[PDB]
């Protein structure tokens, strides 16, 4: 058993990870006070989930978690809610004053000063563990922190931990949930010098978030709650094989293997489905063909996108619930006829299935509905590129200005930097077109 | 904790400030001795960001009066909240500053500035973490113009790396006490250039007009005016003084308002504003659409004549969330030939759920547009029509200054204005 | 149409189909970037107190 | 009030879209680059579809359907006759083509010889054309040789298909003509047949011993007003309407034009236009797609139609400007942006 270390940067990340760490303990059968009954090993063993979590002598099992922000007002909600219980004091870690929504702030005015203490809380998980795969690091592309921290967080792992893979969940950010002009600045600043100490990128695009909540949900206008909840059903579908019993995506390095074949281009797009409305009486349960049949669908990816225009690299099945191998491949079958499902010539026309007969988790009184049989599917397309060109237009819309730019120099970033990140998505558009386009 | 410490300077400085602690305190429940009186935890949620609880769980604002004469301030010790002040923070002189720039920033006014960052370093010494100062005052004046300035000055070189606001009255000749208010705001408005994050320009003509022909008042008076001004000072900082899904603190806003140092001056906004038909209830769309409207803004400037850089819009009031997004989605892109194209969403909005004293429902508007010139403009040829014949010169040649310092103060503002015409094309 | 590598556990399974087959900076480099972002920002902060002094 | 932007300003046809989206009074121009828009008239190559469709409150549509090009283009289109199973390499109704790239440069020229060494050897007419996307650069020949050094002598991608040799001739005249029908397809890919054709017919009598001069067998409206001393002699500007080329067929081949050749163009319009929907649909998409498309086909002596092309950014006839743009704005564009008969238009049903 090699455990992993997650890591929860700013605003973003630590909403999601409280999500999701309470989602896990709802999977996990462990209650707010850390106690596990199933846990027959008191105070220690190599299960599954001893990969998330470690155990104290009075049988608490406390996630190998750590939580970063540069103001308490998010972290503290965790130190007073319902999984209080859950961690210690070490593991959660705030600043005084955030960064302003300014990269440059919180990955150097702010950053230095931090840095050196939360990879010495992170060293504390990292000694506990005998094995450590690498670490899963959430955060939002747009806020100070979540952009200019974790890019710095990532170049300092990369050198204390050379060996070990990291990951990213990354919000991308969407328009209708934030009040923010100079995110996409701080999206091109953290993607160009995170690119080359990130093995695998999940972007999650809240714009996409939205009408999933809207559409599926009925919620007129959606939370954060709302919106953490789900990408919270995502990431537990994402994580599971690390958690559970099983032979596909069994440790970090696996994700980088099969989904990675270009180290550049490591951000794998994922579908969810079914997103059923608790509010309704009852619903119809839909069967193993209808959710893949949906895998397909633009309305339940994460990032809003035309796969039909692109090429795949990879694509990996991972079911939940009542699915057997059998209706997979008859599903599959039935959607490469009725599908346009383009793969690159240097890669096999193949899918990699993975089951797991424990349906999801809801959160009792949350908003999805309890289904029999659910799926998550990761693919690596060239049409997620159509979310760094939007990206990379409103960068260049007001950098041709320099609208904004003086709050990044006057922080002691230099406006070289900025050419320099953009030319960096420059060469990831072009590299996605070279392996896409004909 | 992120605390303001909130400064209000001059005779105007201090009247508009009283009024704003009355009506904030009036939100927060806290009565005129302090005591918090209230019925929902909101109202004390984010009390500390303008008020310090001393003994006996008593609230006493973060506020510093500061004035040349005693006159004013010995009004506001005996107005309705003047009790609720902390004695040690009125710091005054008494030889006044005869409406002169010069005698509140260089004679006069620096005599007096030392005790007053004697009690500013006092209540910044007490704040866990200082987001940052806020001033009130006038710019035709003497004291919150030139001691004023000169204030932010040395606020600057002590707190150089924290946020400085101002609400800063703009002089007119309509509603004008001297002739020199010209040269005394050409004078402040280099100072706020250079020193300040966030100048909201209130133009004593555009509160006129409004009580005069929106809000029916056949001759208004400075309290009139500064009941517009109270509102609309508790209308902006909503998103800092209440909960919700905001999280913003100063050196946020600034960073997402001023896309350029210097073009860093607002035009703030009211709605309702309804004459006495004054229970009728208004609707999302009637709220969006006289929010937008000039004769709802206090700047005296068209938006129609330049271009919006960022636009904020606060809404207070228990209505439809989705409502309000339908409604500013579509005064935008109904009219997205007067918002910059090359700054993508630079329309934000945010809702809250407590709303003023006495309205269901209001929406205050903080534009950042290129139509301020046209303030600065109106200052310029006013400055330009009397300083070419260097007309009552001599009240401030004999304060120390010299005409060099006018000609740069003229050539700072018609660079200002040139700076803001050229984002406009 | 062929299934490959089915592995079978109680908490669930995982097989391969195929359908067509195929056709850093060191921690001193880190510091040295860290301060001259620091002594960029010390310089502004000089030239404004120098412009204060003034 | 609906806003719309304008992208390709050498579109005649949404030239006048344009010119009448504005007559209503209730849609508004904006710049060309200000992303809050109902409407885009984009581009023709290149169009940022990507950029679609993410605007908070805005329902755009586009006047382009991305991936319409595999049907616009000369190579695209064989590819997808002879690789779609829908079309299968056995369809009827289009010349047998093959894909022939320049040496200097999959490529189908051995598969291209071989029927032509069949056809010499079994005494048939033996005669193709050699074309590409990027002419104006066409050449008729009987001798594979000559076909095959052409394209080398190039550098793009080409096309050698069965020439005609027994092409319907109009009387008087014995001249060559092709078809041209409009095609709108709204975002609910509802597939509408405008109403009024245009054969864009040959002023020169056409001789099948001389394929040098191709004056007689290329019937596009710039040859025949460039390089034919006909032009406008039996029809004003080489162009035939429907109630025109209607009477003859009647007069000359006791038929009508409705059985003898449009239940064919409309039987290969849907055929074409179902094949692509799954990969083209803006059903369940963020952003809403139609398109005009401009149908060219061939007549022979036994009265079956062939398909020439497709055009993507097709003109129209100076006569049915009006009437066709105006349609535009009823079916596709006021569909989804309504306003404060007898369709021009006929409606191809088929199952989605
Ligand atoms: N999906 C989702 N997005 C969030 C959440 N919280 C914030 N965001 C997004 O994050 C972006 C803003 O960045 P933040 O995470 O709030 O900023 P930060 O990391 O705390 O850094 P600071 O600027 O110092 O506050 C916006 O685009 C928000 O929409 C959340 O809980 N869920
Ligand atoms: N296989 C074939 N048999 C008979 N005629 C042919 C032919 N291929 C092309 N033509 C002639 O060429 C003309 C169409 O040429 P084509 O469409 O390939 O070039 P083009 O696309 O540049 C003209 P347009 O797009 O305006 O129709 C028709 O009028 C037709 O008479
Ligand atoms: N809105 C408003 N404006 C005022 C008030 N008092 C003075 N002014 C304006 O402020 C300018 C005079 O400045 P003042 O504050 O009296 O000078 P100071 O006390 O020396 O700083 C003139 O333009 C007046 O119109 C007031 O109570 N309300
Ligand atoms: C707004 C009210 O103003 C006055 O009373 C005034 C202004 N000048 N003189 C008197
Ligand atoms: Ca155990
Ligand atoms: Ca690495
Ligand atoms: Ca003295
Ligand atoms: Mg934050
Ligand atoms: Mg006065
Ligand atoms: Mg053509």
């Known amino acids: 058993m090699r455990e992993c270390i997650s890591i929860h940067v700013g605003q973003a990340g630590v909403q999601i990870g409280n999500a999701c760490w309470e989602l896990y303990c709802l999977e996990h059968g462990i209650q707010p006070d850390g106690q596990m009954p199933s846990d027959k090993t008191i105070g220690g063993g190599d299960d599954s989930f001893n990969t998330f979590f470690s155990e104290t002598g009075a049988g608490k099992h406390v996630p190998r978690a750590v939580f970063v922000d540069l103001e308490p007002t998010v972290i503290d909600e965790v130190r007073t809610g319902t999984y209080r219980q859950l961690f210690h004091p070490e593991q959660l870690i705030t600043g005084k004053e955030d960064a302003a929504n300014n990269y440059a702030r919180g990955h150097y005015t702010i950053g230095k000063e931090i840095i050196d203490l939360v990879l010495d809380r992170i060293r504390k998980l990292a000694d506990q563990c005998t094995g450590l795969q690498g670490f899963l690091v959430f955060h939002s592309f747009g806020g100070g922190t979540g952009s200019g921290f974790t890019s710095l967080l990532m170049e300092r792992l990369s050198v204390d931990y050379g060996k070990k893979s990291k990951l990213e969940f990354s919000i991308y950010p969407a328009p209708q949930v934030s009040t923010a002009v100079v995110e996409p600045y701080n999206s091109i600043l953290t993607t160009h010098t995170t690119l080359e100490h990130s093995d695998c990128a999940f972007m999650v695009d809240n714009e996409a978030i939205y009408d999933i909540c809207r559409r599926n949900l009925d919620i007129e206008r959606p939370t954060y709650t709302n919106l953490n909840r789900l990408i919270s059903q995502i990431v537990s579908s994402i994580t599971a094989s690390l958690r559970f019993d099983g032979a596909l995506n069994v440790d970090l390095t696996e994700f980088q293997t099969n989904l990675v074949p270009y180290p550049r281009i490591h951000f794998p797009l994922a579908t969810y489905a079914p997103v059923i409305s608790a509010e309704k009486a009852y619903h119809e349960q839909l069967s193993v063909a209808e959710i893949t049949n949906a895998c397909f669908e633009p309305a339940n990816q994460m990032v809003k996108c035309d796969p039909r225009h692109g090429k795949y690299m990879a694509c990996c099945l991972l079911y939940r619930g009542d699915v057997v191998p059998k209706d997979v491949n008859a599903a599959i079958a039935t959607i490469k006829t009725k599908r346009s499902i383009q793969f690159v010539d240097w890669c096999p026309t193949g899918f990699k299935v993975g089951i797991n007969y424990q349906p999801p988790t809801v959160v009792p009184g949350g908003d999805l509905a309890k289904v029999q049989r659910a799926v998550c599917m990761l693919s690596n397309t060239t049409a997620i590129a159509e979310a760094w060109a939007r990206l990379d237009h409103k960068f260049d819309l007001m950098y041709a200005k320099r609208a904004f730019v003086h709050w990044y120099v006057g922080e002691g970033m230099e406006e070289g930097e900025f050419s320099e990140a953009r030319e960096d998505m420059a060469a990831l558009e072009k590299d996605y077109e070279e392996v896409g386009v004909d | 904790m992120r605390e303001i410490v909130h400064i209000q300077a001059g005779q105007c400085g201090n009247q508009i400030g009283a009024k704003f602690w009355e009506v904030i305190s009036d939100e927060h429940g806290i009565d005129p001795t302090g005591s918090y009186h209230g019925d929902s935890d909101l109202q004390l949620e984010r009390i500390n960001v303008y008020y310090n609880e001393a003994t006996g769980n008593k609230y006493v604002p973060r506020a510093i009066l500061v004035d040349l004469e005693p006159g004013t301030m010995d009004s506001v010790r005996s107005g309705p909240f003047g009790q609720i002040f902390r004695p040690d923070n009125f710091v005054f002189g008494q030889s006044g500053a005869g409406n002169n720039w010069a005698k509140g920033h260089y004679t006069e006014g620096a005599e007096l500035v030392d005790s007053v960052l004697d009690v500013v370093r006092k209540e910044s010494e007490s704040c866990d973490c200082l987001q940052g100062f806020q001033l009130t005052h006038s710019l035709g004046g003497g004291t919150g113009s030139g001691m004023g300035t000169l204030l932010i000055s040395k606020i600057r070189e002590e707190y150089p790396d924290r946020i400085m606001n101002t609400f800063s009255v703009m002089p007119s000749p309509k509603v004008s006490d001297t002739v020199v208010e010209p040269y005394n705001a050409t004078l402040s408005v280099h100072q706020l250039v250079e020193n300040t994050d966030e100048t909201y320009c209130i133009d004593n003509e555009a509160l006129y007009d409004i009580c005069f022909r929106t809000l029916k008042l056949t001759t208004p008076t400075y309290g009139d005016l500064n009941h517009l001004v109270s509102a609309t000072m508790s209308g902006v900082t909503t998103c800092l003084r209440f909960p919700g899904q905001l999280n913003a603190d100063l050196r946020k806003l600034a960073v997402n308002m001023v896309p350029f140092p210097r073009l860093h001056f607002f035009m703030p906004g009211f709605a309702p504003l309804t004459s006495r038909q004054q229970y009728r209830a208004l609707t999302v769309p009637e709220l969006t659409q006289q929010m937008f409207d000039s004769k709802n803004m206090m700047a005296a400037c068209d938006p129609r004549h330049g271009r919006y850089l960022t636009v904020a819009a606060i809404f207070r009031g228990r209505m439809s969330m989705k409502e309000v997004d339908e409604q500013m989605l579509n005064v935008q892109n109904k009219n997205s030939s007067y918002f910059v194209e090359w700054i993508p969403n630079n329309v934000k909005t945010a809702v809250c759920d407590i709303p003023p004293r006495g309205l269901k429902m209001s929406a205050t508007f903080i534009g950042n547009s290129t139509a301020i010139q046209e303030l600065f403009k109106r200052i310029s040829e006013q400055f330009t029509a009397m300083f070419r014949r260097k007309a009552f010169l001599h009240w401030y040649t004999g304060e120390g200054m010299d005409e060099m310092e006018f000609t740069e103060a003229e050539s700072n503002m018609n660079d200002l204005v040139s700076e803001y015409q050229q984002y406009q094309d | ?54 | 009030m609906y806003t719309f932007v304008v992208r390709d300003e050498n579109s005649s046809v949404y030239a006048e879209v344009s010119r009448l989206l504005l007559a209503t009074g209730q849609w508004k121009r904006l710049r060309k680059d200000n992303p809050r828009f109902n409407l885009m008239l984009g581009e023709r190559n290149r169009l940022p579809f990507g950029r679609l469709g993410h605007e908070p409150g805005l329902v755009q549509l586009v006047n382009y359907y991305r991936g319409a090009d595999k049907l616009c283009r000369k190579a695209s289109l064989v590819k997808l006759i002879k690789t779609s199973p829908e079309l299968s390499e056995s369809c009827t109704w289009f010349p047998e083509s093959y894909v022939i790239y320049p040496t200097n440069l999959t490529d189908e020229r051995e598969v291209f010889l071989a029927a032509y060494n069949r056809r010499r050897e079994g005494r048939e007419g033996n005669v193709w054309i050699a074309k590409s996307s990027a002419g104006a650069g066409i050449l008729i020949s009987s001798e594979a040789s000559e076909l095959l050094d052409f394209i080398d002598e190039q550098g793009q991608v080409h096309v050698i298909q069965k020439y005609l040799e027994k092409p319907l001739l109009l009387e008087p005249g014995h001249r060559k003509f092709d078809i041209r029908s409009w095609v709108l397809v709204d975002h609910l890919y509802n597939i509408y047949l405008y109403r009024e054709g245009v054969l864009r017919t040959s002023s020169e009598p056409y001789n099948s011993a001389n394929f040098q001069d191709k004056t007689c067998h290329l019937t596009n409206h710039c040859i025949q007003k460039e390089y034919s001393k006909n032009y406008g002699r039996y029809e004003e500007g080489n162009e035939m309407f429907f109630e025109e080329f209607n009477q003859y067929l009647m007069d000359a081949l006791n038929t009508t034009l409705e059985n003898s050749i449009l239940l064919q163009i409309k039987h290969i319009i849907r055929s074409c236009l179902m094949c692509i929907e799954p990969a083209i649909s803006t059903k369940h998409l963020h952003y809403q797609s139609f398109q005009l498309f401009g149908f060219d086909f061939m007549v022979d002596e036994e009265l079956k139609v062939w398909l020439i092309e497709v055009n993507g950014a097709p003109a129209c006839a100076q006569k049915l400007y009006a009437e066709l743009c105006q349609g535009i704005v009823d079916v596709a564009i006021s569909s989804v942006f309504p306003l404060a008969p007898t369709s021009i238009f006929i409606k191809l049903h088929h199952h989605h």
């Open chain 3, 1 to 54: 149409m062929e299934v490959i590598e089915l592995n079978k556990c109680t908490s669930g399974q995982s097989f391969e189909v195929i359908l067509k087959p195929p056709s850093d900076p060191s921690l001193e480099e880190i510091q040295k970037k860290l301060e001259a972002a620091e002594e960029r920002r010390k310089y502004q902060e000089a030239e404004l107190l120098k412009h204060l002094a003034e």
